[PDB]
Design a binder for this molecule. Structure first.
Ligand SMILES: O[C@H]1[C@H](O)[C@@H](O)[C@H](O)[C@@H](O)[C@H]1O
Ligand SMILES: [Fe+3]
Ligand SMILES: [Fe+3]
Ligand SMILES: [O-]
Length: 258
């Protein structure tokens, strides 16, 4: 799992992180936040959006080579079986990767999927391929962003950090805009679930607040289902749909703005 030294997909995953690192700059993230922050691209229900991902495969994932819609159901199912008393958490599983619809809207996948990292400051060691994929990034030539803290004050809190643009931040802002009625923990887990250097690699604590640290266990708990439920054996989506539609009706019903 999560093997970046070996694997049959390693070729397309290295290409995709080298290209996203080489191009996720402060300006770019700043533009994309505006480009998508009005959620005026499409109107859809959750299940519509999930079904859109019937038409999408993730090019950064070394563990998956099937429509990402299925992965949504697998993650929700893993969570549901381990945390029966937390239905909202089951939904988070289904919802967490819906931001990848951007790839169907013409975005290059390096601007949609993959591990995230803060722009505006020096990449730390636990960033996938850090040593070999950042040399062509203009921000690093910029004294404003080349240092450890870069443009940030210490412990500013991750909510005040500009993350590399992708499905995490898109979906987080989407849910705020539509006013999903999930607990704070849900919004936070989704917003930072891709931030491996932080929740796994132990890095970027120079930017974290005590609030962020307190959320670490929640992100890590979601993460283990996010990652380890990935399997070629697909779920019976038709059978599962009604259960998850019930949760959708409770937490984020009807047509939403994307
Ligand atoms: O390849 C995976 C996939 O893109 C996940 O959706 C994302 O959250 C992870 O950070 C990434 O490593
Ligand atoms: Fe994800
Ligand atoms: Fe995922
Ligand atoms: O994920």
């Amino acid at each position: 799992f999560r093997n970046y030294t070996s694997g049959p997909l390693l070729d397309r995953v290295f290409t995709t992180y080298k290209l996203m690192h080489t191009h996720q700059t402060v300006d770019f993230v700043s533009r994309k936040r505006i480009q998508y922050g009005s959620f005026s691209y499409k109107k859809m229900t959750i299940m519509e959006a999930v079904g859109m991902l019937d038409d999408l495969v993730d090019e950064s994932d070394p563990d998956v080579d099937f429509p990402n819609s299925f992965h949504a159901f697998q993650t929700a199912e893993g969570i549901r079986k381990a945390h029966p008393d937390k239905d909202w958490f089951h939904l988070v599983g289904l919802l967490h990767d819906l931001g990848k619809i951007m790839a169907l809207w013409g975005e290059p996948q390096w601007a949609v999927v993959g591990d995230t990292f803060p722009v505006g400051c020096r990449p730390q060691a636990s960033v996938v391929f850090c040593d070999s994929t950042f040399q062509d990034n203009p921000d690093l030539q910029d004294p404003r962003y080349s240092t450890e803290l870069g443009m940030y004050q210490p412990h500013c809190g991750l909510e005040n950090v500009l993350m590399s643009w992708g499905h995490d931040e898109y979906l987080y802002q989407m849910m705020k805009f539509n006013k999903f009625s999930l607990p704070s923990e849900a919004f936070y887990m989704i917003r930072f679930h891709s931030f491996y250097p932080w929740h796994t690699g132990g890095d970027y604590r120079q930017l974290c607040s005590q609030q962020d640290l307190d959320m670490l266990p929640w992100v890590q708990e979601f993460n283990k289902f996010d990652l380890y439920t990935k399997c070629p054996d697909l779920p019976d989506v038709e059978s599962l749909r009604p259960y998850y539609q019930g949760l959708i009706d409770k937490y984020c019903p009807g047509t939403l703005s994307w």
